[PDB]
Amino acid sequence: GSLTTISSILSLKREKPDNLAIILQIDFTKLKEEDSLIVVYNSLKALTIKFARLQFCFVDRNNYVLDYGSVLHKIDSLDSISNLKSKSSSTQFSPIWLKNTLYPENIHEHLGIVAVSNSNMEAKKSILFQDYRCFTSFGNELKIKVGYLNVDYSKIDELVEASSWTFVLETLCYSFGLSFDEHDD
Question: Helices 35-47 and 165-175: crossing angle, nearest 10°?
Answer without folding.
Answer: 20
